[PDB]
Amino acid sequence: QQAALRNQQAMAANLQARQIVLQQSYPVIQQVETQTFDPANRSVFDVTPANVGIVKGFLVKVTAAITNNHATEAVALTDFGPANLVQRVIYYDPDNQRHTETSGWHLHFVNTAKQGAPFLSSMVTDSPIKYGDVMNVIDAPATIAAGATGELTMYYWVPLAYSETDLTGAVLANVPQSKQRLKLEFANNNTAFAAVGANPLEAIYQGAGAADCEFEEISYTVYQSYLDQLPVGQNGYILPLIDLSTLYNLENSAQAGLTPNVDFVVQYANLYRYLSTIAVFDNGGSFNAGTDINYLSQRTANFSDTRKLDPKTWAAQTRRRIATDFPKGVYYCDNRDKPIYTLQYGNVGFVVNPKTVNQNARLLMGYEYFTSRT
Amino acid sequence: ALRNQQAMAANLQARQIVLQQSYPVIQQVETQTFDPANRSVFDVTPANVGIVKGFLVKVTAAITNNHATEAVALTDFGPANLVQRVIYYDPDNQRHTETSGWHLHFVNTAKQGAPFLSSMVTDSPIKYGDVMNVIDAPATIAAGATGELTMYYWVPLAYSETDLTGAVLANVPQSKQRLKLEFANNNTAFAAVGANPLEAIYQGAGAADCEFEEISYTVYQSYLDQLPVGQNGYILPLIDLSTLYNLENSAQAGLTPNVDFVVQYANLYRYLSTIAVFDNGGSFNAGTDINYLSQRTANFSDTRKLDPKTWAAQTRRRIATDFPKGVYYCDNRDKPIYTLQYGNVGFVVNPKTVNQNARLLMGYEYFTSRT
Amino acid sequence: LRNQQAMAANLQARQIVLQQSYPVIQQVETQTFDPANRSVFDVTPANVGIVKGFLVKVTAAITNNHATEAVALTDFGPANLVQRVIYYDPDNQRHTETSGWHLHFVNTAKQGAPFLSSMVTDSPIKYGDVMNVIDAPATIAAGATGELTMYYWVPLAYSETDLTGAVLANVPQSKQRLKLEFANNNTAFAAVGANPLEAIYQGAGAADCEFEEISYTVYQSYLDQLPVGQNGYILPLIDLSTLYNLENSAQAGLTPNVDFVVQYANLYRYLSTIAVFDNGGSFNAGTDINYLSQRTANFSDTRKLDPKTWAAQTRRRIATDFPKGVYYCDNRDKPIYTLQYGNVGFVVNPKTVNQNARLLMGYEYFTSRT
Amino acid sequence: ALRNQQAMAANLQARQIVLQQSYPVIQQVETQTFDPANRSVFDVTPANVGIVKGFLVKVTAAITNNHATEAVALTDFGPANLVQRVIYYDPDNQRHTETSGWHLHFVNTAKQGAPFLSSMVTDSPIKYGDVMNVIDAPATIAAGATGELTMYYWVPLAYSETDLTGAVLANVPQSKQRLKLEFANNNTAFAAVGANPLEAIYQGAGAADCEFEEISYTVYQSYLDQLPVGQNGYILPLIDLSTLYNLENSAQAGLTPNVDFVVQYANLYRYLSTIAVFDNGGSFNAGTDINYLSQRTANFSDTRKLDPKTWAAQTRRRIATDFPKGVYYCDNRDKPIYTLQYGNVGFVVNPKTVNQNARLLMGYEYFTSRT
């Protein structure tokens, strides 16, 4: 019957231990690996991080030099640009369980959503003191002319723990036996450059000189963030067992079958607690600023929409979250305080009712969620 | 005093339970497209469901400048003047907010901590930016051109997403709420050169030949559904729901150079913020026509007598930028001005220069009990 | 034992004070002068209630009397209108003693954005740089006069809600001292090729630049109407018995590819660290550094990072980068604190070292009066 | 189980007493005439009196075809598309029906057993016939002409005149009901040649120049007054009044030739009827694009897998004629589809031909408890 007291007590014990760990341990961010390579030779890498304490996440620095060898035509950044330097990232913990498995662009948009502004960007102000884009932390030339070489830098934070204060999703890596694995599939000369008229979704640059663009090199450095000198007690190490037994993951998917003026519904799976949802309307390679959509919504089994909104009003809600708009055709939904959980109510779905549908149209979905390891 | 402390504790607990148990919903109530030359006042009827927190009003418009040669340029308030006035009445016909579109917009900005629904400029190479034109208006409309504008206003009932003070319980099937929107028209939106631009959207030598082609609005109602029920029916924050959170504005005149112009906080309201616009006879200056501003108590002592730039500095800490020329803001959120805690209090402006027809347009944000 | 209750009581008292007292910001002094005559002033604040800090407004007019050459803002620009600040409390104990530029950078770090700046947005409503709160012309042409405005917040209390470091002066009687040293005709202008670190403008016309005049207004922020209880005034004894200070220092002896370590002293709880790499008058955007770090003897580096990654952490704190050669480190949640002198150090491993290279350090810290 | 059997017996007895003792009333609630170019959404406020059974909505309209030369002709749904959507909320703000005008109309027909409020043609020499034009619309509107239309919809709360399941008790003075009517406008009512006629009233080469001149509606509320009182106050069928009888519709896509397209009865509702409209990319065919239709249980067994004409034969027994092209009906009134009695059940369509943008518009009639 009742006995649910266990949960209540478990939550309290988990929160208490989390606090003790945060108070007693010390945060460390350490380089684990750096490599420079030619994408023509290789683009997929498997990084083996260190097994020390509780791992919170990885900061991945990526730099690249791209030369546009075309005789006459230039190329220009796509909407995602340097966020496409990493095509896909997948993490496995010591028990070989998969956590995040998503695209670089999705990971980057979530980094932005969680910062509350374009990730690691430099705001512009009227200050006479010379603050500004001094260090080019995330940077890429808007265009690369025929014969020119452009230099790019972009960063991604691959999260395990939900935040610096909420260790839900963190990973205990102390078993010398099995290693963690951070797999990075980088852009290469076949994904980074889109010809005029081709789909720019996964590309960095697009334009009439694309066929002659090539990477001179790509370099990456993985920094691992963790907590060391974990606190001990009578029963050994004090550890938030729920935090460490919960997966905090980002995943993406693709769905097709849209038709003008008809509700296109993407169901949320059960068991997962969805914190945020991103929907990219790849309208056959065209990315529009809401003009190809009637409305978007989140709906429960009951025909009840909780936020059926026209595109600009939907965008207004997002401006309250990241202080600007996501790129054309990218829509965001924050459900952090009340995660979508199909057990709480009936099934739930994310809805897009398109106004215009080009051939090969599809919705690319990105999700942020918590789920029990077991 | 024990009855009160316990009353407040019960209120907060009820608020916390309502927030945890109910689910927020935002849904369209009504949309209409019209020509303000035909009609500019609309009475929108909100849906009677659960606890109502506020309304998000989307307003779009198309304006054409048919002057033969001259352009017009945005005034300092611009699209914020698409709505001239907003008035809300609850199911008991008790009036809450009644103010101008520009004042409501400035409070929306103050509460956001940055220009309302704006897009911040950064060095990011990823193409974030003004993609969706949520609030937008062309800087100028040339002779012969048509410009498109978009504006949003949040009309609050509840103070915030987490503080339900001022919210409205609308579950009485036969008692309707009323949200009255009075829009701009050709007479208010266009100011000739030299005319007062306060209420206008565009001003310039081409003003006489400017006309709206159309205006459209869509009202979205934000509320809480599936209200928690307990051993006495609905668990409700009684103090929250019987308190009014309102915005109102008024005009004060009688300014003279180097003399303290004092606007008494005339009511027994709890004033959360004050906005003072120095409409210096149609001229709006960046502090240069003011010696200092202050808030003062009957005790004749000033709690913040500041030169204009220093006053502006405090505002920059609140909204990360300055309000338009001649607009001054004062935050009293944590310690609301309440004349029953200290002597009467006044908002003070000592002008350096005073043109003909000078006046202070005062905007207030406050809490007051229904009874 | 104890303490748990001492801190619990301190925090309770702080809360009562914040709830019952009323905040006041009041002008205490204004003055206009010509730096050719004087540039050091000792301001006497009012001894009333609990003092939280001072907002210092500085305005200046600079004339470029050169015949044909202009000058342009240095990276610090108007932040160098005040060269140094020192505050002494009623008990003759010093709190902050630092440079104007370091004080300004901490003001920015605490705000989470360039201090008192106006953020640019797409809003059609005319918000923006309307009031020129902190302002200075990018260049002053030969024969021109430029007008500048700068603000500094000299903190005693850590924040509006944390009174640690605040000063009780409603009684003390003995006077407080807020010492301010302003820029002058010898520090404000740097010739081409000269070190621009402490200057406001640099350029070919510098030798003929001069101040027309400088003015300052000091506003004092304090809490009045302090709450009284049984034993008397209800006060957070820990808050009022703790110093929250900013201090600067200079270190030299850098050599290419070798770790240059600046030791943290014991006793102090360091909340933030700023290191400026004055590479012999050249200020570079990380290109002259291999890495920076904070290290514990026998426990290695807790954050050894390349310059751009170090800068990324700072972008999370102030939403932009500090000027060239200026590096920031936030340790607010877990202050650097060693019982032994130098059990922790700030590290810079330089890639390039010019003649007269040095690191100018700036610290924010808490420490007991006793 | 005894508590239930007795609960049902008490309910029926209470229903029977209410029907015998109360007196039925039908009275006008509101009338309005407007131009949908100005406004097309209306929130009607029903009167709070006794037990409410439903609303009869009279809708009239005048449409003018100003094309220079081309006519327009009625679509298959025609005047049933004068109302695009209808939504009802009771005094507790619980939503009941929310569906399209065409779906509501088809259910009105199914429940009547013949085209709703139609006039049957006979050989009688006495002049019975279409005398009053209760539901009427000209077959075509020629270039330069104006046509007049009349349409009626019955919005049900109670299931029928004798079965009060779904009825609403409205005797709470301050809790209002809401009947929202969303009408057609120039954008929805006129379809160009080759465009999808699903939601339109007229389609033809003259469509671009067609305009409504006006639309008028009159809502009549049907209820029971003088409710019987006994030894405990009002004698009321508690199960009837706490059960919702609703209509809803949705769209399903993903059809491919010769493959079973299954629409699962996704909720735990008691589905009384199902309507499936095969909008084959804007084409509506008389069964020729379908191999068979069926209702199937998880057990993979079909209870009625039928070719289109045989499926149509069953419907002819229900409404004495066929529904329009592409509209298929399924009666489950005596044994409602209820997934908790048998495995999940699905409605099946195996298409012979599938055009681009093909979809099934599903309309359901069902009972569900408030809790």
Curated annotation (Swiss-Prot), chains B, D:
Signal peptide: none annotated. One of its GO terms (cellular component) is viral capsid. The keyword Nucleus does not apply. The keyword Glycoprotein does not apply. It is found in: Virion. Transmembrane segments: none annotated. Keywords: Capsid protein, Virion. Pfam families: Phage_Capsid_P3 (PF09018). Its main location: virion. Homotrimer. Major capsid protein self-assembles to form an icosahedral capsid with a pseudo T=25 symmetry, about 66 nm in diameter, and consisting of 240 capsid proteins trimers. The capsid encapsulates an inner membrane and the genomic dsDNA genome. The major coat protein P3 and two assembly factors (P10 and P17) are needed during the assembly of the virus particle inside the host cell, when the capsid protein multimers are capable of enclosing the host-derived membrane, containing the virus-encoded membrane-associated proteins. This is Major capsid protein P3. It comes from Enterobacteria phage PRD1 (Bacteriophage PRD1). The lineage of its organism: Viruses, Varidnaviria, Bamfordvirae, Preplasmiviricota, Tectiliviricetes.
